[PDB]
Write a protein that binds this ligand. Structure first.
Ligand SMILES: [Cl-]
Length: 217
């Protein structure tokens, strides 16, 4: 009965999104928190995207593979960097968010978007996943850079808790790093487990991640 979630930065690779589809089928995943999707493989899959750019570029999206899962969109909260979507079942109602922060753009405006989502969406049932392009030992990075610090500060103000674990690089090229973060409201801990990094849930310099949403009660 666990709702499995996939988190991955596809880097606009046509192949990576094919791999993502294959992994979701295999793992029987219900959700995918995506960043940098390309522009096919997703048939009866509902996809919710962040505001598209002139050339059609979408930086974040949320794929729902579970055909019967109740979904609710929040156009007011979705931007060019984040997409917010609620999922509902008898057991609960969870607001999900997939985000992507450019490595060469001020993180400040993105932190405000996180705040806006948190306040205008209640202090409970929140799960965020994406590429923050920010380093912090709190999520296994080699060190705490200034971006990681700003993000951590924001997390602290919102009561958001890091789900990351281990030191497996979420980005490998050599050059390895952990810039992808997953965090949630306090109440979500106890409903989430199995957070791990698929050594290669894909093939686009970024490593996919996986975790479950249960009930335990
Ligand atoms: Cl790192």
């Amino acid at each position: 009965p666990p709702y499995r979630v996939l988190q991955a930065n596809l880097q606009r690779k046509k192949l990576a999104t094919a791999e993502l589809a294959i992994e979701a089928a295999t793992r029987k995943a219900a959700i995918a928190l995506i960043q940098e999707p390309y522009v096919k493989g997703f048939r009866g899959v509902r996809v919710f995207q962040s505001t598209a750019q002139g050339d059609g570029t979408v930086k974040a999206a949320i794929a729902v593979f579970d055909h019967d899962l109740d979904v609710i969109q929040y156009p007011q909260l979705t931007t060019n960097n984040i997409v917010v979507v609620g999922i509902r079942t008898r057991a609960w109602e969870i607001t999900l968010v997939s985000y992507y922060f450019e490595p060469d753009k001020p993180i400040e405006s993105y932190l405000e978007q996180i705040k806006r989502v948190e306040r205008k969406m209640g202090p409970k049932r929140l799960i965020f996943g994406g590429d923050a392009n920010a380093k912090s030992t709190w999520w296994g990075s080699k060190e705490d850079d200034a971006r990681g610090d700003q993000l951590m500060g924001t997390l602290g103000e919102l009561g958001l808790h890091i789900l990351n674990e281990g030191d497996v690089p979420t980005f490998d090229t050599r050059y390895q790093s952990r810039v992808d973060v997953t965090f949630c409201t306090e109440d979500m801990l106890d409903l989430i487990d199995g957070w791990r990094v698929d050594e290669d849930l894909v093939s686009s310099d970024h490593n996919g991640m996986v975790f479950n949403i249960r009930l335990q009660k």
